[PDB]
Amino acid sequence: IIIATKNGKVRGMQLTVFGGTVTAFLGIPYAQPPLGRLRFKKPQSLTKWSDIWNATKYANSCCQNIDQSFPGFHGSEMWNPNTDLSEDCLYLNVWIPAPKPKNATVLIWIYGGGFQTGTSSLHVYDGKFLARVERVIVVSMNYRVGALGFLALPGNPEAPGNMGLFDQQLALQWVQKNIAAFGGNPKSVTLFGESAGAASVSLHLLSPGSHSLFTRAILQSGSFNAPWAVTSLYEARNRTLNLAKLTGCSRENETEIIKCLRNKDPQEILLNEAFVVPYGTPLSVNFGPTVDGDFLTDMPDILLELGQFKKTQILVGVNKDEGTAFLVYGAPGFSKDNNSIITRKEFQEGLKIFFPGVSEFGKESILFHYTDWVDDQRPENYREALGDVVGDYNFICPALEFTKKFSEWGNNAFFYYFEHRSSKLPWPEWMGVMHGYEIEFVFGLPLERRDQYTKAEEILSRSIVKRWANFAKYGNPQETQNQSTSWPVFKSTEQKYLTLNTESTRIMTKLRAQQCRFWTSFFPKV
Ligand SMILES: *[C@@H]1O[C@H](CO[C@@H]2O[C@@H](C)[C@@H](O)[C@@H](O)[C@@H]2O)[C@@H](O[C@@H]2O[C@H](CO)[C@@H](O)[C@H](O)[C@H]2NC(C)=O)[C@H](O)[C@H]1NC(C)=O
Ligand SMILES: CCCCN[C@@H](Cc1c[nH]c2ccccc12)C(=O)NCCCC1CCCCCC1
Ligand SMILES: *[C@@H]1O[C@H](CO)[C@@H](O[C@@H]2O[C@H](CO)[C@@H](O)[C@H](O)[C@H]2NC(C)=O)[C@H](O)[C@H]1NC(C)=O
Ligand SMILES: *[C@@H]1O[C@H](CO[C@@H]2O[C@@H](C)[C@@H](O)[C@@H](O)[C@@H]2O)[C@@H](O)[C@H](O)[C@H]1NC(C)=O
Ligand SMILES: *[C@@H]1O[C@H](CO)[C@@H](O)[C@H](O)[C@H]1NC(C)=O
Ligand SMILES: *[C@@H]1O[C@H](CO)[C@@H](O)[C@H](O)[C@H]1NC(C)=O
Ligand SMILES: *[C@@H]1O[C@H](CO)[C@@H](O)[C@H](O)[C@H]1NC(C)=O
C-alpha cells in the first residue's frame, strides 16, 4: 500500500468494491504548484520529496467559476467542484486493481467543462469501478482551466497559451515514468475524455510532444474541430486585453501586463473572466486552446486535413440530445421546469442567442434547413429544432467530420451513438439523452445495484465498460462473449456506426447526413 515513485513514496488506501478491493492513490502531485511567479506559465517539473506522501483524499480543484444558474439542483451541481478551489491544483489520481496487476492497460481520463470548469474528483469520474471490473489502471488529472489555464499572449512565455493542455501533457509524462511501479504498462495507455476533455484528446493526437505518451484514444462528445474548441489568435488577444483593462492592468510592455495580472487575486481574475466575450453564449469558451506554436504548431483543421497526427485507433461518439442542456441557459421561452414549447418567433430569437455574430442570412439559412417539417401542427416542433441545431452544430457533425478525416488516413475508427436516457436523470424528459450523461455508464456506476439504476442499465453499462476496456487493451471495442452485435469500423465510404441503448444495439449508416452537409460544407461560409 506504499509505492516508490521517481520523486518519492506515496501511500494509498484500499477500497471495498463489489466484494473485492481496489487500491486508490488520490491526489498525487505531478508538478510544481503554479503560484506567484509561475502563474500563467508552463508547468514545471516536480522535484523529490522527503517522506511518504499521503495520497488518501482528492486534492484541490483548480480555480473556476461555478454554475449557479440552478442552486440546489443536482443536474447542474453534480458538475460543480466537490473539493476546495485553489491555484495549487496540479494533482492526479490512480486506481489500481488489487491484487496489484503485472502489466495492466492504463486508462487516462481528461474531464470536460468547456475548458473553464472541471475537476477529476467528480462522483461520475470515480475510477474504482473500472479497476475492479476490468482490471485496468485508471488515471485522472486536474488541469488549469479558464484564464489561469489558457490565457495567451502568443510566443511570450509569461502567458504563451495552452498551459492547461501542457498540464495534461505533464501528467501523461508522469504515467510514462511512474506507472510501471503501480503495475501498469506504459506501453498500453488510452486517453479518454468528454466534451472539452475529448477535444483535448483530439489535440493530443495532433501535438507531436504527446505522440509518445499514449497509444490509443477515445472521444466522447468532443473534438478539436468543434466551433467552441479553439480560440483564434485574433480573439485570444482581444480577450486577454479585455481582461487587462477590466483589472486596470493595461500597459504597453506586454510583459508588464502579465506581471500586473500576477498580483491580482484569483477571484478578481475569476470575476472579470465572464465579460471578455463581446456577446456570450451558453457555449462560450472564454479562454481556450490556441495555436501557440509549441503545443499546436499550426491551425488544427489543416493538420487534420493533411494527415498530421498520431496514427492509431480511435473510438468516437456522441449522444442523441447533445444540444438540449444549453437551451435553458439563455434561450428565450425555455426552462428545465416545464416542457418548453416555443413558437417560431422564440426560435428565431434563440438563434440570435446561440449565433450572435452571424449575419441575418446565416440565421435565416439555419431556420430554413431545420424548419421543413413533415408536420406543421406539432407543438414541440420549434423546441426540438433548436436543441438539434445546437447539438448538430456544436458536437455531432464535428465529431463525425473528425472521424471521417482521421479514418481517411488508414486507421481503424469506431463511432457510437448513445441514445439511452438515464432513469435517474434529474433534468426533464424533453431534454432527452443529454450532454454528459453517458459518462456514468462508461465509468460503471450502474454496476452498483445499490443506487437505483434499472437492471437494463446495469447490463448496458456492463457492456460499455467491456467494449471500452477491450478498445483500450486490444484496439477493438467488441464484447465477444455474450453474443453481441459486432461493432464495425467506420470508413469514409460506409460510415457505419453503433447505437448504444437498452433495447437493441443496431448498426446504422451515415448519422445526421443531411444535417451535417449543411453544417460542415454550406454553413462555414457565411
Ligand atoms: C415555460 O417556462 C418559461 C420560463 O419559466 C418561467 O420564468 C419565470 C419568470 C416564472 O414565470 C416561472 O414560473 C417560469 O419558470 C416561460 O417563459 C416565460 O413565458 C412568458 C412568455 O412566454 C413570460 O412569463 C416570460 O417572458 C417567459 N420567460 C422568460 C422571458 O424568461 C414559458 O412561457 C413556459 N412555457 C410553458 C409552455 O410552460
Ligand atoms: C459567457 C458564458 C461562458 C459559458 N461557458 C460554458 C462552459 C462550458 C461547459 N460545457 C461546455 C461545452 C461547450 C462549450 C462550452 C462549455 C458554460 O458554463 N455553459 C453553461 C451550460 C453548462 C452545461 C449545463 C449543465 C449540464 C450540461 C453540460 C454543461
Ligand atoms: C474586440 O474587443 C473589443 C474591446 O477590446 C470590443 O470593442 C467593443 O465592442 C463592443 C461592441 O461590439 C462595444 O463595447 C464597443 O464598441 C467596443 N469597445 C471599444 C473600446 O471599441 C470588440 O467588440 C471586439 N471586436 C469585435 C467584436 O470585432
Ligand atoms: C501519513 O499517514 C500516516 C499513516 O496513517 C495511518 O493510517 C491512516 C489510515 C490513519 O488511520 C492514520 O491515523 C494512521 O496513523 C500517518 O501516521 C502520518 O502521520 C501521516 N503523515 C502526514 C504528513 O500526513
Ligand atoms: C509489458 O508488455 C510490454 C508490451 O506491451 C512488454 O514490452 C513489457 O516487457 C511487459 N512488461 C512486463 C510484463 O513487466
Ligand atoms: C519591457 O519591454 C522590453 C522590450 O520592449 C523588454 O526588454 C523588457 O524585458 C520589458 N520589461 C521587463 C520588466 O522585462
Ligand atoms: C454476460 O452475461 C452474464 C449473464 O449471463 C452477465 O452476468 C455478465 O456480466 C455479462 N458480461 C458482459 C461482459 O456483459
Side-chain angles (χ1 to χ4, degrees), residues 158 245 280 293 303 389 411 435 500 525:
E158 303 304 329
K245 249 179 241 165
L303 317 165
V389 160
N411 285 114
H435 188 73
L500 293 172
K525 300 182 211 139

Side-chain angles (χ1 to χ4, degrees), residues 321-341:
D321 294 274
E322 293 284 0
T324 46
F326 301 88
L327 307 178
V328 300
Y329 285 76
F334 270 95
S335 153
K336 78 170 200 79
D337 296 311
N338 64 17
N339 65 339
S340 284
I341 314 279

Side-chain angles (χ1 to χ4, degrees), residues 29-59:
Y30 67 88
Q32 266 173 56
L35 287 323
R37 312 71 170 255
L38 292 186
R39 181 190 286 176
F40 292 121
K41 301 227 299 143
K42 294 224 254 175
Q44 313 292 310
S45 48
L46 194 38
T47 176
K48 305 65 83 185
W49 66 81
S50 309
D51 40 300
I52 316 187
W53 182 286
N54 273 347
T56 41
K57 68 182 292 227
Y58 293 115

Side-chain angles (χ1 to χ4, degrees), residues 78-90:
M78 66 182 295
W79 310 108
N80 293 318
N82 68 331
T83 203
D84 265 291
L85 314 164
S86 162
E87 287 179 86
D88 171 7
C89 63
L90 296 185

